[PDB]
Design a protein around this ligand. Structure first.
Ligand code: NA
Length: 361
């Protein structure tokens, strides 16, 4: 009943330890281990099987107009090859999913959807497309991320194109292949989407490079959390608007002013009213991590918020977390508290990212 990765056997051969995520059986860690896999990515090149994510193609003569209604983007202004972070909003401007949109041609675009939301995102995009002369197509693909300071060199030595991309650009080097210079680590890196029948060979070719190791979901999580990146279902949900989540930067002024996207009225009203709670970085004042779901209190014991993500960051060399506090507590350095074994434990509100980003310039 958990979904199976196309490359499951490679993970089994690599000695992966498996667990459930977003309805898939995923490698959580390998024998290298959560700490060294994390550190490996920041020093070398980590290979991540992210085939649980979903590519959705959007194609047809009115793809541009459809996209500018479905999402808060000006799809006509996106240059061919350019990627943008965006989100599918509901009528109340809650975030159904966060997405990356890439223009591939005048009438062709690609979306990458999160694993847990792929089916719902596809159904909702299809309904928003009812009026438009465009098609929305869920693709069957393997998706690999190759991340770290050596990733570009590994890519070149494997004979794959992409070193010419800038950060947040993408292209199609072969029919049914899609490569982007992007990721979820705060490092330089790439994502490669390709047909399922071509994938095992590619993954074995990249792993064969002495700079490359497989990285599991645990380390994927510590990396992204150090980088200050949101995880939908933890840090953003259909109950959090981009205003609460401090993600309004993703919607440029011209798009706000045109207000043609689904959710625009609620988005604009939320922007005027201000946030109902605020996504913040949190630094536990302890060597032991505070985990997702930890309740946050003020200095008098009143419940004020919650930790949405938390773990040990090996690069930061201590616990890192993110969560929600009311606007009054969002100032950098503000003390908030949680309870552990009946003792009050302090966290301070902390800038994000925790670790400096090293995207290609
Ligand atoms: Na290797």
């Amino acid at each position: 009943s958990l979904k199976t990765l196309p490359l499951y056997e490679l993970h089994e051969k690599a000695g992966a330890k498996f667990g459930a995520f977003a309805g898939w059986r995923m490698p959580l860690t390998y024998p290298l281990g959560v700490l060294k896999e994390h550190l490996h990515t920041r020093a070398h090149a980590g290979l991540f099987d992210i085939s649980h994510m979903k590519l959705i193609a959007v194609e047809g003569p009115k793809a541009v107009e459809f996209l500018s209604y479905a999402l808060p983007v000006d799809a006509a202004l996106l240059k061919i090859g350019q990627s943008r972070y965006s989100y599918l909003l509901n009528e109340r401007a809650g975030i159904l999913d966060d997405l990356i949109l890439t223009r591939l041609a005048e009438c062709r675009f690609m979306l990458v959807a999160n694993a847990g939301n792929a089916q719902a995102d596809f159904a909702e995009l299809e309904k928003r497309a009812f009026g438009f002369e465009c098609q929305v197509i869920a693709l069957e693909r393997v998706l690999l991320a190759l991340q770290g300071p050596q990733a570009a060199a590994v890519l070149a030595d494997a004979g794959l194109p992409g070193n010419e991309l800038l950060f947040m650009q993408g292209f199609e080097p072969q029919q049914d292949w899609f490569i982007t210079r992007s990721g979820y680590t705060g490092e330089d890196g790439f994502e490669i989407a390709l047909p399922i029948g071509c994938a095992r060979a590619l993954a074995e070719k990249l792993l064969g490079d002495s700079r490359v190791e497989w990285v599991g979901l645990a380390a994927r999580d510590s990396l992204r959390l150090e980088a200050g990146l949101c995880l939908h279902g933890n840090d953003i949900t259909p109950d959090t608007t981009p205003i609460d989540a401090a993600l309004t930067w993703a919607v440029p002024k011209n798009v706000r002013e045109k207000a043609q996207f689904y959710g625009a009225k609620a988005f604009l009203e939320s922007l005027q009213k201000g946030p109902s709670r605020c996504r913040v970085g949190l630094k536990p004042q302890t060597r032991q991590p505070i985990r997702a779901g930890a309740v946050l209190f003020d200095n008098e014991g009143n419940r004020i918020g919650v930790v949405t993500s938390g773990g040990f960051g090996p690069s930061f060399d201590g616990p890192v977390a993110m969560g929600y506090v009311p606007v009054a507590w969002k100032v950098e350095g503000t003390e908030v508290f949680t309870e552990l074994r009946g003792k009050k434990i302090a966290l301070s509100v902390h800038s994000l990212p925790f670790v400096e980003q090293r995207y290609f310039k």
